[PDB]
Design a protein around this motif. Sequence first.
Motif, PDB file in Angstrom:
ATOM      1  N   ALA A  55      -7.347   7.515  -2.488  1.00 46.42           N
ATOM      2  CA  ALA A  55      -7.696   8.031  -3.808  1.00 46.42           C
ATOM      3  C   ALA A  55      -8.857   9.023  -3.744  1.00 46.42           C
ATOM      4  N   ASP A  56      -9.525   9.076  -2.595  1.00 42.86           N
ATOM      5  CA  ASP A  56     -10.635  10.002  -2.405  1.00 42.86           C
ATOM      6  C   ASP A  56     -10.126  11.448  -2.314  1.00 42.86           C
ATOM      7  N   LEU A  57      -8.829  11.600  -2.028  1.00 39.26           N
ATOM      8  CA  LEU A  57      -8.187  12.913  -1.918  1.00 39.26           C
ATOM      9  C   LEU A  57      -7.606  13.304  -3.277  1.00 39.26           C
ATOM     10  N   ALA A  58      -8.472  13.350  -4.284  1.00 39.67           N
ATOM     11  CA  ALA A  58      -8.080  13.685  -5.648  1.00 39.67           C
ATOM     12  C   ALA A  58      -7.383  15.032  -5.815  1.00 39.67           C
ATOM     13  N   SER A  59      -7.812  16.030  -5.047  1.00 38.64           N
ATOM     14  CA  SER A  59      -7.232  17.369  -5.134  1.00 38.64           C
ATOM     15  C   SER A  59      -5.846  17.475  -4.491  1.00 38.64           C
ATOM     16  N   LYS A  60      -5.360  16.367  -3.938  1.00 38.50           N
ATOM     17  CA  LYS A  60      -4.047  16.331  -3.295  1.00 38.50           C
ATOM     18  C   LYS A  60      -3.152  15.254  -3.917  1.00 38.50           C
ATOM     19  N   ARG A  61      -3.602  14.675  -5.026  1.00 39.03           N
ATOM     20  CA  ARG A  61      -2.848  13.628  -5.706  1.00 39.03           C
ATOM     21  C   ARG A  61      -1.420  14.034  -6.049  1.00 39.03           C
ATOM     22  N   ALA A  62      -0.477  13.130  -5.794  1.00 41.49           N
ATOM     23  CA  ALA A  62       0.928  13.366  -6.109  1.00 41.49           C
ATOM     24  C   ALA A  62       1.383  12.310  -7.116  1.00 41.49           C
ATOM     25  N   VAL A  63       0.808  11.115  -7.019  1.00 44.02           N
ATOM     26  CA  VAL A  63       1.149  10.015  -7.917  1.00 44.02           C
ATOM     27  C   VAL A  63       0.049   9.779  -8.959  1.00 44.02           C
ATOM     28  N   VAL A  87       0.773  -1.232   0.000  1.00 41.71           N
ATOM     29  CA  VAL A  87       0.000   0.000   0.000  1.00 41.71           C
ATOM     30  C   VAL A  87       0.808   1.288   0.000  1.00 41.71           C
ATOM     31  N   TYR A  88       0.348   2.251  -0.792  1.00 39.27           N
ATOM     32  CA  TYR A  88       0.959   3.569  -0.829  1.00 39.27           C
ATOM     33  C   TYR A  88      -0.183   4.589  -0.799  1.00 39.27           C
ATOM     34  N   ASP A  89       0.177   5.848  -0.576  1.00 37.44           N
ATOM     35  CA  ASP A  89      -0.755   6.970  -0.483  1.00 37.44           C
ATOM     36  C   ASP A  89      -0.600   7.802  -1.755  1.00 37.44           C
ATOM     37  N   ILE A  90      -1.658   7.883  -2.562  1.00 38.12           N
ATOM     38  CA  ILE A  90      -1.576   8.630  -3.816  1.00 38.12           C
ATOM     39  C   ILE A  90      -1.201  10.099  -3.651  1.00 38.12           C
ATOM     40  N   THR A  91      -1.333  10.615  -2.430  1.00 37.08           N
ATOM     41  CA  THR A  91      -0.995  12.004  -2.145  1.00 37.08           C
ATOM     42  C   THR A  91       0.467  12.169  -1.721  1.00 37.08           C
ATOM     43  N   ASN A  92       1.206  11.066  -1.651  1.00 34.90           N
ATOM     44  CA  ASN A  92       2.597  11.125  -1.212  1.00 34.90           C
ATOM     45  C   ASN A  92       3.524  10.289  -2.105  1.00 34.90           C
ATOM     46  N   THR A  93       4.356  10.977  -2.887  1.00 32.44           N
ATOM     47  CA  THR A  93       5.295  10.324  -3.804  1.00 32.44           C
ATOM     48  C   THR A  93       6.276   9.418  -3.078  1.00 32.44           C
ATOM     49  N   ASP A  94       6.712   9.845  -1.896  1.00 28.27           N
ATOM     50  CA  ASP A  94       7.648   9.063  -1.083  1.00 28.27           C
ATOM     51  C   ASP A  94       7.079   7.687  -0.716  1.00 28.27           C
ATOM     52  N   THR A  95       5.794   7.635  -0.363  1.00 27.21           N
ATOM     53  CA  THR A  95       5.186   6.359   0.000  1.00 27.21           C
ATOM     54  C   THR A  95       5.133   5.418  -1.197  1.00 27.21           C
ATOM     55  N   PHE A  96       5.079   5.992  -2.402  1.00 28.00           N
ATOM     56  CA  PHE A  96       5.045   5.219  -3.655  1.00 28.00           C
ATOM     57  C   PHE A  96       6.433   4.590  -3.889  1.00 28.00           C
ATOM     58  N   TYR A 130       4.106   0.975 -13.792  1.00 29.32           N
ATOM     59  CA  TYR A 130       5.007   0.334 -12.841  1.00 29.32           C
ATOM     60  C   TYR A 130       4.483  -1.062 -12.491  1.00 29.32           C
ATOM     61  N   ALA A 131       3.183  -1.154 -12.207  1.00 32.01           N
ATOM     62  CA  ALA A 131       2.548  -2.423 -11.861  1.00 32.01           C
ATOM     63  C   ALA A 131       2.603  -3.414 -13.024  1.00 32.01           C
ATOM     64  N   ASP A 132       2.348  -2.923 -14.235  1.00 35.12           N
ATOM     65  CA  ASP A 132       2.379  -3.769 -15.430  1.00 35.12           C
ATOM     66  C   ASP A 132       3.779  -4.289 -15.722  1.00 35.12           C
ATOM     67  N   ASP A 133       4.790  -3.460 -15.463  1.00 37.49           N
ATOM     68  CA  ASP A 133       6.179  -3.851 -15.693  1.00 37.49           C
ATOM     69  C   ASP A 133       6.644  -4.875 -14.659  1.00 37.49           C
ATOM     70  N   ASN A 134       6.006  -4.889 -13.494  1.00 39.98           N
ATOM     71  CA  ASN A 134       6.401  -5.813 -12.442  1.00 39.98           C
ATOM     72  C   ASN A 134       5.376  -6.894 -12.129  1.00 39.98           C
ATOM     73  N   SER A 135       4.374  -7.025 -12.990  1.00 41.61           N
ATOM     74  CA  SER A 135       3.321  -8.023 -12.809  1.00 41.61           C
ATOM     75  C   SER A 135       2.644  -7.907 -11.445  1.00 41.61           C
ATOM     76  N   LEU A 136       2.118  -6.726 -11.158  1.00 40.50           N
ATOM     77  CA  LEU A 136       1.436  -6.492  -9.895  1.00 40.50           C
ATOM     78  C   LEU A 136      -0.035  -6.205 -10.171  1.00 40.50           C
ATOM     79  N   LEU A 137      -0.911  -6.676  -9.290  1.00 40.55           N
ATOM     80  CA  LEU A 137      -2.351  -6.443  -9.423  1.00 40.55           C
ATOM     81  C   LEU A 137      -2.595  -5.053  -8.822  1.00 40.55           C
ATOM     82  N   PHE A 138      -2.742  -4.054  -9.689  1.00 44.43           N
ATOM     83  CA  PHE A 138      -2.923  -2.669  -9.253  1.00 44.43           C
ATOM     84  C   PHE A 138      -4.349  -2.140  -9.243  1.00 44.43           C
ATOM     85  N   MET A 139      -4.641  -1.330  -8.229  1.00 47.64           N
ATOM     86  CA  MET A 139      -5.942  -0.696  -8.064  1.00 47.64           C
ATOM     87  C   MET A 139      -5.828   0.490  -7.132  1.00 47.64           C
ATOM     88  N   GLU A 140      -6.448   1.610  -7.492  1.00 46.13           N
ATOM     89  CA  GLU A 140      -6.450   2.751  -6.578  1.00 46.13           C
ATOM     90  C   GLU A 140      -7.648   2.500  -5.660  1.00 46.13           C
TER      91      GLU A 140
END
Length: 164
Positions: free
Chosen positions: A118-126, A82-91, A134-144
């Motif tokens: 992802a509900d914090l759309a106005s604060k999105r960083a990623v 898990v990462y926070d879409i509002t924080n690039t570092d967490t990504f 990134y997920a497709d290149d590493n075969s990860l099941l991705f979802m916001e």
Amino acid sequence: ICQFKLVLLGESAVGKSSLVLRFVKGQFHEYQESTIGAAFLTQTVCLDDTTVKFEIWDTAGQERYHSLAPMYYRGAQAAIVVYDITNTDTFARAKNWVKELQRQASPNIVIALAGNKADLASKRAVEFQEAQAYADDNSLLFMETSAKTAMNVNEIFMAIAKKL
Ligand SMILES: Nc1nc2c(ncn2[C@@H]2O[C@H](COP(=O)(O)OP(=O)(O)NP(=O)(O)O)[C@@H](O)[C@H]2O)c(=O)[nH]1
Ligand SMILES: [Mg+2]
């Protein structure tokens, strides 16, 4: 009837406990206490003629607990980083959790990537596109996702179950 071991990993405060709480109890606490070590929860779902029971290990994201992570992911059949879409570092931190899993976890483990808050759309960083590539290149099941609104919470766990 099926049973799978699942572990959640990610930087502190990204929303791991909130995601589990929403899926397992349907609850969301705006005031959630940082996890100490790890918490355990189970949930049973109906999936295409098969009753799947999830054994979930919600790990504490703080670095001081990093050395304990293997205890929870070693026998895991699936992981949600898990990462926070509002924080690039967490990504960036999530990418290192993925690298670690791919290198030290079960070779056949299903790895999901959750861009939480992802509900914090106005604060999105990623941007969604970057995480998807990134997920497709590493075969990860991705979802916001959003533990707060419940967006894609049930969906991510269910998609994981289908692939197990
Ligand atoms: N807006 C919003 N806030 C969220 C969301 N998910 C979690 N939060 C909030 O973010 C804070 C941290 O969530 P928590 O689940 O404790 O994070 P964690 O990743 O479990 N932390 P740790 O790894 O330290 O235990 C809490 O205030 C929680 O309410 C979300 O989807 N949207
Ligand atoms: Mg927690």
